[PDB]
């Protein structure tokens, strides 16, 4: 990956999360499960939808009377017609293949990016109240219940609240 998340330090995807492209898997004593971040997902869906649409919207029709016939003394301009057609066709095929190549790469990088962003968002919310074990996971040095969880997820996480128990179970190690 370019941003090092997809096929990155997160080494795999989840067949278990069907509700979006990006999301969290959590664990705690009120139960575990999969969720997807609907905001990041929805945003990416908008971006890619618009990418596609703008790709198919970038062709405006050039119409003609194409069908053309030349006699046996017309050979030169006939081959000129052939040259024009073949050349245009080569250019357009080229532009197509190139476009899908580049934009595909950029799309994958885009997903990788979004994932990274979600991660570092969570991590930068948490700080030292938990520990990053790698693989895009965090172990909570304190107890994070449902409300706490959804608090991280929706960005409202309160550090001061659990800070003490965090430093307790933490510095006991540190």
């Amino acid at each position: 990956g370019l941003f090092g998340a997809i096929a990155g330090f997160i080494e795999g995807g989840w067949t278990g999360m069907i509700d979006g492209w990006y999301g969290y898997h959590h664990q705690n004593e009120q139960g575990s499960g999969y969720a997807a971040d609907l905001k990041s997902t929805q945003n990416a869906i908008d971006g890619i939808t618009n990418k596609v649409n703008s790709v198919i919207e970038k062709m405006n029709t050039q119409f003609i009377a194409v069908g053309k016939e030349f006699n046996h003394l017309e050979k030169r301009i006939e081959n000129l017609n052939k040259k024009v057609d073949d050349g245009f066709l080569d250019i357009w095929t080229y532009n197509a293949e190139l476009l899908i190549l580049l934009e595909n790469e950029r799309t994958l990088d885009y997903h990788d990016s979004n994932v990274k962003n979600l991660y570092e968002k969570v991590r930068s919310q948490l700080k030292n109240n938990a520990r990053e074990i790698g693989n895009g996971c965090f172990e909570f040095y304190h107890k994070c219940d449902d409300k706490c969880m959804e608090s991280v997820k929706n960005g409202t996480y309160d550090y001061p609240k659990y800070s003490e128990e965090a430093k307790l179970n933490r510095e006991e190690i540190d």
Binding site: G1, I6, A7, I10, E11, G12, G13, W14, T15, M17, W21, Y22, G23, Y24, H25, N28, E29, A36, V52, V55, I56, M59, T61, F63, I64, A65, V66, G67, K68, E69, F70, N71, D85, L89, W92, T93, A96, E97, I100, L101, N104, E105, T107, L108, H111, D112, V115, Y119, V122, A130, I133, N135, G136, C137, F138, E139, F140, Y141, K143, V152
Partner: protein, 301 residues
Amino acid sequence: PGDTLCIGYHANNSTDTVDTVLEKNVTVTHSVNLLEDRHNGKLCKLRGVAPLHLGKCNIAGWLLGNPECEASSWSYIVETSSSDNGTCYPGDFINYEELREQLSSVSSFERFEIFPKTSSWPNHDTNFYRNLIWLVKKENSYPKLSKSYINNKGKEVLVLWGIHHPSTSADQQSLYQNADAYVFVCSSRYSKKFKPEIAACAGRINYYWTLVEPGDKITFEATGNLVVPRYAFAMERNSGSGIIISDTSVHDCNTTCQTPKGAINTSLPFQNIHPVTIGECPKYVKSTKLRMATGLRNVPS
């Protein structure tokens, strides 16, 4: 018992494969195909208006009135690969391809009798093509003829005629009575004087055409060797139409886009089906596959 929260991404059964720059054959959770290979393999109408299928005859056979043929408008014109002029005689068609390219530009197409069968030729005999009359001598005589036309419509008029070159003088007199003969025709866009070139290679007939602009008059004058217009074609412009060559069959159906292979309903930007198409539809490409990635890299485990 460390109460984990993890961040991750989607994966699924999807086998869709797409090519990036630095890596190929990548499995992705989601993708869309931009290249339409699908067509109904029928010749349909186009934005409402049906096409004109010349059937057995080709353009020339059509315009000259081949009897194995036989209306006013079209979306596009269709020829078979088996199509042929209904000739008859060895002769040549002059500026035929241009004539075609002209027909590609038209739409409405009123036809009419420019020179009425009965009334027009009291002094001569009629010797085949419906749209022309082959005039020969009455008894001994082939009098000098002058016939004119003025444009009573608001449109150009396509006028086609033909010229005979008997393979021998004997034929020349047997038909047109005159060993020394001329034919000449002028509109204001046009003048030509054809005199018979008598030789063998029976008889030979060369066909010519011209467009008389509205109000302009055309004139035919002959001492012999003239195949005269019976019907001429009043034509008012589109700026477009098109000529398709296909053996495919015409059905009841509509298309935004037609190809000699068949037609297409697709919103896709790209089509590799046929280089020849009519209406609003995809750019033509030599690509076998264009598949754009939408979702992300698929890593099931």
